Each structure stands twice: as structure tokens, then as C-alpha cells.
Structure 1
């Protein structure tokens, strides 16, 4: 049975105006800016951007990849597909 989201979990994350996007739950580094309450820091593969999202916009990757894990013309998307499949836990700074 599922747990709450934790750092390192792999997802597709939904933002307004964007396709469901390959992403991970990030940690928050010591001394770094924390998210708002009930929000998680989401790192988006390919773009390497961070947004703060809640669970309603977070789709576990394993369950969802058949539906959402296909190429997209959008900038960074296909790089992001490679990242989440091949090195999802790397440093992308």
C-alpha cells in the first residue's frame, strides 16, 4: 500500500499549460529555501527547473509511464525522458 511522497520518488508532474512532465521529488539542502506547507519541491528532468507542487499534480512514474512517457515536441521533454529512465538520481546542477 502506498506511502506519502518522499525525496527521490519518481513522478510525472502536472503544471498548467504543460504536458505531464518527468520529474522527481527533491530534497531540500541545508540552508536552502523551503517549499510552502503541503507542497513538495519538484525537479523537472530535461529543463532542470524546480516548482512547488502538491500530491494532486504528482503521478507515480511506474504506474503512469505507459501513458505519459512518450516524446513531446516541448523544449527539454525528450532529454527529461532519458534522464528519468537512465539516471534519475544524478546531480543535474
Structure 2
């Protein structure tokens, strides 16, 4: 059975106006800005940007990749697909 989301988990993350996007739940570094309650720090592969999202917008990658893991014309998406398949736990700073 599923657990709650934790840092390191791989997802497609949905924001308004954007296709479901390869991403991971990030850690919060010592001294870093924490998310709001009930929100997770989402790092978006390819763009390397961070937003705060709740579970309603988070699709676990293994279940969802057949549907959402296809090339897309948007800036950074295909790079993002490479990253989540090939080195999803690397430093992209």
C-alpha cells in the first residue's frame, strides 16, 4: 500500500497551463525556506525550477509514465524526461 510522499519520490507534477511534468519531491536544505503546510517542494526536471504543490497535483512516476512520459514541445520538457529516467537523484544546482 502507498505511503505518504517523501523526499526522493519521482512524480509527474501538474500545474495550470502546463502538461504533467517530470519532477521529484526535494529535500529542504538546512537554512532554506520551508513550504506552506500540506505542501511539498517540487523540483521540476529540465527547467530546474521549484514550486510548492499538494498531493492532488502529484502523480507517482512508475504508475503514470506510460501516459505522461512522451516528448512535448515545451521548453525543458524533453531534457526533463532524460533526467528523471537517467539520473533523477543528482545535483542539478
Q: TM-score range by the shorter chain?
A: over 0.9
Q: RMSD over aligned Cα, in angstroms?
A: 0.1
Q: Secondary structure at the match of 1:43?
A: strand
CA deviations 1:37-60 (Å, max 9, x no partner) are 000000000000000000000000
Answering whether residue 38 of structure 2 is matched by residue 38 of structure 1, we say yes
Q: Which runs of 4+ in 1 moved over 6 A?
A: none
CA offset at residue 87 of structure 1?
0.0
CA deviations 1:33-82 (Å, max 9, x no partner) are 00000000000000000000000000000000000000000000000000
CA offset at residue 83 of structure 1?
0.0
Please report the TM-score for the alignment, with normalisation by the length of structure 2.
1.00
The aligned counterpart of 2:59 is 59
Structure 1 stretches lacking a partner, 5+ long: none
**Number of corresponding residues:** 93
Structure 2 stretches lacking a partner, 5+ long: none
CA offset at residue 28 of structure 1?
0.1
The 2-side partners of 1:35 and 1:51 are apart by: 9
